[PDB]
A paper describes a structure:
[name] (GS) is an ancient enzyme that catalyzes the ATP-dependent condensation of glutamate and ammonia to glutamine. Here, we demonstrate that human [name] (GS) can reversibly polymerize into filaments aided by a composite binding site formed at the filament interface by the product, glutamine. The glutamate/ammonia binding site is gated by a flexible loop that bears two key catalytic residues: R299, which interacts with glutamate substrate carboxyl group, and E305, which is predicted to deprotonate ammonium ions to ammonia, enabling the required nucleophilic attack of the y-glutamyl phosphate intermediate. We propose that GS filament formation constitutes a negative-feedback mechanism, directly linking product concentration to the structural and functional remodeling of the enzyme.
Loop conformational heterogeneity was also influenced by nucleotide state, as the filament map with ATP only displayed partial density. Taken together the E305-loop is sensitive to nucleotide state and also by filament state under turnover conditions. All maps had similar resolution range (FSC0.143 between 1.95 – 2.27Å) and showed defined secondary structure and amino acid side chains in helix-12 (266–288) and beta sheet-11 (313–316) on either side of the loop at similar density contours.
Numbering used by the authors:
A (entry chain A), B (entry chain E), C (entry chain D), D (entry chain G), E (entry chain H): 2 to 373
Write the structure that this text describes.
């Protein structure tokens, strides 16, 4: 059920990591590969501790081993974008998230931060805040959910949501370790809870301003994969890991601006929802790395989900595409929640689409090539 | 056998838990679900350490995943009531027990603290003290008592009560860990002992004044479930876990007022017992989350138990419904013990009934609405 | 071969035991049950650390669960007698050895300390010293000696006495842990050695003055049982655990008075041995909880043992019932050793008989009712 | 999951069973014990093969060991009633079903065949025919259904009914062996099929005239238990072995007389249905060995069943209490089916109640005396 | 739990055992060893099949290896007494039960057949008949009953007597093989049944006239041990294999003569029982190979047993020392049953004591030392 690497003696490893480091510093570079969903990493040694992200040098990798580059001109380039403390090696070592560029310095096909950053800079005075709810499922190496009966199923759903106890919550050791690692690293983690499906979990990131939302979620995803690797289990972001009467996985996105958060900001919330109602197909394509096919296995209109074909909005409606919390409606200010994005969405795509539709008043089925 | 989660490498988890936290603080919210027996929890991040319960924010959860609300209006609200230190994450993180309210702010069906608190405030000058003896059995994930022979039975009862040794006491590691965690958290745990059935244990909570009795017992129950989850075993509060000639599980409740604790207070003890003798059926219904059916499997008048049908009382009588300790009768002051409540009773329901019958002079089969 | 409780993750338990305790203090009460050989225990919480044994309150327990009372009037009472530091929970927690009294305050049937203490007060000016050598065998949960071949036997005796090495000494981890725990608790442990039988061991307690010999040996027995519970093995004091050509288990008792320890004290040693020669049957009955039946399986006159029904004494004779060490005989002062008591003897019975015969000049087959 | 006896080398047994018997003949005596549900057996040696049941001698057993008598007059007696060929020992050995009588030669409490034979003799010319469909569940020795995932569940119902394949039929080896064993013995087995719940099966016995129905069903149950003993699994007749969304087990009874089998015999069925409608409570009590404490957990009105408190009828209605097959109504001739009795019913009780209600026109809550 | 030899491939052995033997004949010699309750065997080759026991040659063995002699005149001799067909090697191979004689041609100490045969010849004209019920317990090689839970107990007694099913009968494969093996060999086996304790069984031998009773029972015991050797389990004849509330094992002896079997033979039974009442202590000593130190742990006066120190008799009284069947009393002819002998009794000793007291009118303490 668990990997062979996780059966090695971990006490031996801790003895080596107790050795004082000395003067050199380790930096781990992290980037998104050609599938748009996977992460890659490698480590270099630095002479001294970097104080800001601008002090880190550019790097490179062979793009033919990541299905990102052609044959002859295979070299790709890494440009640091955000820096965090490394929870796996501790201070003064760092984690570095990078943008990917081709040999001719054009952005890579899966490099979506480059365009999203420019869009964020166009509306910086409105101070957009984002909050994302990442759902995932812990799986054994055999392709079955962790802690499930072998070749079988646990009891029916209902007691597992926010559950406590040996027979209710599976794999809380991973969840606790991931929570503390994110806090140490500097990732803005807001909370966690157990989900309807046993061995299914959720963590919230935010509220984050502008481009930082995508950076924090991607690094949080990397930390989860690396923590699960220590325990020998697999975390999956597939929207429908188990077919049938078992809960799916999504990534709800909460959105607000400076105008929405002030008194009588509910008026501006309703304006944005009206604009979103006219671009349902555009956001479905942008909320999936495959264009909507992945989300079709999840958004069928059952198990507290909305239909993939129809747009709906309402106050305190958890079955609609867009939900206004009851407290927000009562206080006439706050935010609203988009429940359409799938659990494997790219945050840079999702946040860029929301700004384009709601703040830049874009129409049609294509993004505006220059600005808005 | 134990759960798959308990076979993960716990040394790995402690490495992550050793990371310094930083400035943010974790708060775990805890509430009682729609069955009136189970507990639920989830965690949010706070900006700074809360000093009192009054400065924690309200929260919410989806009640359709806990069988507490219907479809359209499913949002429920959490209101903090009592705060303790978190033994699983250590200072400055907190545990928060909450009351549950519906979407229209009316109390939930299983929210019995709201009415119990008002009753306790009616008799605050009499200073009621409660002491509760919680019995439970440790279970394997296969539904059999922990440490019992597979598909079989251990030796006859008699050597397991207050026992010591590998062949006499099963699961003392859980008991020791639970005791220390409660002391750290601030729960008023008074003692523990091994019970007549092997793998059966007991811990005592009190003496607690007023509404704080229910708060301390529920948090103690939560800590036990969470501790057992680490070891991979299940703690059950079922009154009769094993049929036949094996000891059952109850929750004895000790009761005293300021008048009973003073000299010649035995007179007021005798008066309260007389009032209790006239309301046997009312207390049987209130001492069970199912109206008394659960307690029928345990209270059959055998193995040092009282009859479910009959009321009896006496000094130093462990076979009666109400027992006056021999010391209390000798010093003519003290308290008395109600031995009827089952091990899965709700403390808020049990304590409210005692106040209504003994201090508010209520009669009939229904509680008196507003005042007494 | 070992218990299910011992396969739980002990690292998890140590995390909880690392939590700072706070202001409250745990006290474990220990007493002897109705079989005269087994120990019982339970824990209560105190508000502050007790400084002397007189500050601890009286307690009680249900005697019908320990075969010490039946029917009505089954409550028993515990009176603290001696206090030690708790090695399992560390300072400021305490272990408390108690005397048992029935509901009418008469001493219980197996409470032999009450009479033994009064006898020791009658000879206080002679300062009797006692030293006892407790032998025991470590056993697996399957009823076979620990580390022995399954359904088989190890090699013949001879290399195991005071042995070192994986093939010579079984279970030294328990012996080392028990030694350190006794030193921490304050028990006057004098040494240990491996015995002729593999997995058989011995520890020495003393020299102890008066009634303190019984208190120290009983607490050492409890500590041994509790330590073995941690490792998942059973320690047995049965005189002949394995039938045939395998070493038995005894409890040799060394005795001396102030006159015996002074120069030319060998004269008073010979006087006491002369008195002992006339009361062989009386001491055989008092050296066993069954009146001598258990010791019959051991004292057959083989394997360096004396005959059960014959009395003998000599200098440097290890086959006699009473042995005078050669050093003592050469220096004309010291002590002497009684080799008759079985390994499961009650120390209060053994010490009381020695005082009555040697210092109070009692005759007949019954103890003198009043003083002397 | 399987018994220790099933892990013995079965090839060794087959060698001994191939030895020629000689001239002696074995005979196995079977009778119903004091619970009214289980069976008991023992073997004796006869000098020659009996040609009919009337040549078998009487026997006896100890009734105190079977919970059928006290210690004063414990002896009970066995009178053979029906003979069958032995499928476990082959010819010329026999199985004999016996009636149980007290020491005073009066029928035992669970001996329901005596009165049923007397009742059935009174309607001989009508030639009543019976056919019963017996359902059962195969269980491992751990108390879980055989082949189910450990501490878990298989997929939801729907593919298991009459299924074929490793993932659809659990334990067909037992079913095939039982079918062939019954045919060899002379049991009138009509067919088998796999049931809705996995590891649940059904066999049909009949049409058997008169008292012969109870003899054939009881022997078939004994053969099933004995066959399952060879494989090491347990056959259970519980009405609801698994709680929840899983099918229960019943024993449908098919009834017809000569009149209903003749031309236009459908009209004689209608009076039988009409007569049965007024005695629903009386028949429910006689359809359960525990008076209704078992069938109450199956007849819940769901899973295509009928409610325990309501009587229904109709042509080709499987949800009613009584079903008339569609072909029977089309041909206006045949039988009708009673779906009320549980799987653990006594066939003698069921057949007697049907005869005395539809053929003797009995009323009231008590069986008629010599008047009927 | 089973022997290493039983895990060898038994299919390989059956291949060799199917080879045609040829003209040589195997004969196995069986005799009782120096302990008086164990058996020994040895095999030799004969030129042709013996037609009767009288043409089997005498043999010999080493008595020092069997502890029936010292190292000076260790040689002993075997004289054939009874011949049986070999069930383990099939025809024409044979089993031979032999008497043991010293080097000086005098009977061995445990050779009780020699004197018993002379006693039977004295009263041969009355044709005494004997029938013995031999009880035994099946054990694993670890010293625990076969099929019992590891280091534990099954459910309480009551369903195991004459039970059927995987959870009620333990090890019926051995019982079925032994029954068929005895019939093939010519042993007069009368029947079998399961006993009160699980894994405990019984078989009956008789009615056997005179000296043949001891021959048939001893061969039956040998066949059981040899059959159990094939399966890898141990059959024990200990009177009290498991201490506590678990049934013991005895060897009930049924006795009758021609007068008792004739008309009005009940009056002759009363004389024998009256004569038996006087020599209770004499028979108790002769009913135990250890003189009474084995049967003392069974005849406790509980679990339907008679106290070893009390003689009692009565019609159909299973708690008495002597039982008269109810049918015998009603028919005034038959036999009577002696319930005193233990399971490990010597049939020659038991049958000789019954003849001496009831038929020869002997009295006193020691047997008559001359023929007349
Ligand atoms: N003003 C805001 N602007 C943007 N995001 C916000 C704002 N306020 C809160 N959020 C984010 O909204 C999210 C709240 O989601 P949470 O999981 O706590 O509740 P929920 O949506 O009611 O739950 P569920 O999982 O049942 O849908 C968090 O990620 C938080 O950071
Ligand atoms: N004055 C008091 N008022 C209320 N509760 C009290 C008072 N004094 C003590 N108690 C409570 O009474 C309980 C004592 O019960 P404990 O389990 O120690 O003994 P017991 O009832 O005699 O034992 P058993 O488990 O055999 O019934 C504790 O929970 C304690 O807090
Ligand atoms: N003066 C004394 N009075 C009483 N006891 C004493 C005195 N001096 C020593 N002792 C005790 O005598 C005991 C000696 O036991 P020890 O195991 O050393 O004996 P040993 O001679 O090696 O014998 P063995 O081979 O039987 O174990 C110790 O318990 C010690 O405390
Ligand atoms: N005339 C008859 N009288 C009595 N019993 C009959 C008669 N004809 C057939 N039977 C019996 O009725 C039974 C028919 O059961 P069967 O399970 O085959 O029917 P069904 O309608 O498919 O049942 P199910 O409720 O399981 O779907 C058989 O045992 C058969 O012997
Ligand atoms: N006339 C007789 N003389 C001697 N033995 C006889 C006679 N008739 C029968 N027997 C033998 O008596 C034995 C009866 O044993 P069986 O177990 O059937 O008796 P039971 O009364 O049921 O006793 P229990 O309940 O104590 O086992 C058989 O071995 C049988 O051969
Ligand atoms: Mg959420
Ligand atoms: Mg959400
Ligand atoms: Mg208590
Ligand atoms: Mg109590
Ligand atoms: Mg020593
Ligand atoms: Mg010594
Ligand atoms: Mg059918
Ligand atoms: Mg049917
Ligand atoms: Mg018998
Ligand atoms: Mg008998």
């Amino acid at each position: 059920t668990t990997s062979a690497s996780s059966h090695l003696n971990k006490g031996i490893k801790q003895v080596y990591m107790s050795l004082p480091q000395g003067e050199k510093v380790q930096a781990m570079y992290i980037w998104i590969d050609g599938t748009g969903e996977g992460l890659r990493c490698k480590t270099r040694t630095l002479d001294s501790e970097p104080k800001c992200v601008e002090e880190l040098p550019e790097w490179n990798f062979d793009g033919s081993s990541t299905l990102q580059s052609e044959g002859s001109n295979s070299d790709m380039y890494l440009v640091p974008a955000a820096m965090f403390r490394d929870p796996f090696r501790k201070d003064p070592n760092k984690l570095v998230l990078c943008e990917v560029f081709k040999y001719n310095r054009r952005p890579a096909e899966t490099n979506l931060r480059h365009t999203c950053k420019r869009i964020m800079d166009m509306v910086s005075n409105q101070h957009p805040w984002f909050g994302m709810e990442q759902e995932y499922t812990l799986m054994g190496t055999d392709g079955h959910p962790f802690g499930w009966p072998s070749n079988g199923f646990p009891g029916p759903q209902g007691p597992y949501y926010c559950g406590v106890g040996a027979d209710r919550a599976y794999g809380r050791d991973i969840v606790e370790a991931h929570y503390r690692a994110c806090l140490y690293a500097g990732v803005k983690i807001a909370g966690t809870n157990a989900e309807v499906m046993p061995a299914q979990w959720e963590f919230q990131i935010g509220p984050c301003e502008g481009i930082s939302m995508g950076d924090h979620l991607w690094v949080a995803r990397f930390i989860l994969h690396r923590v699960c690797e220590d325990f020998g289990v697999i975390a999956t972001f597939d929207p429908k890991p188990i077919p049938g009467n078992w809960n799916g996985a999504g990534c709800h996105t909460n959105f607000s601006t400076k105008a929405m958060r002030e008194e009588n900001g509910l008026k501006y919330i309703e304006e944005a929802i009206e604009k979103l109602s006219k671009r349902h197909q555009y956001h479905i394509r942008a909320y999936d790395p495959k264009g909507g096919l992945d989300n079709a296995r999840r958004l069928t209109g059952f198990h507290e989900t909305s239909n993939i074909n129809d747009f709906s909005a309402g106050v305190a409606n958890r079955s609609a595409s867009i939900r206004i919390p009851r407290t927000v409606g009562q206080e006439k200010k706050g935010y609203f929640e988009d429940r359409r994005p799938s659990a494997n969405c790219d945050p840079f795509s999702v946040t860029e689409a929301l700004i384009r539709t709601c703040l830049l008043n874009e129409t049609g089925d294509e993004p505006f090539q220059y600005k808005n």
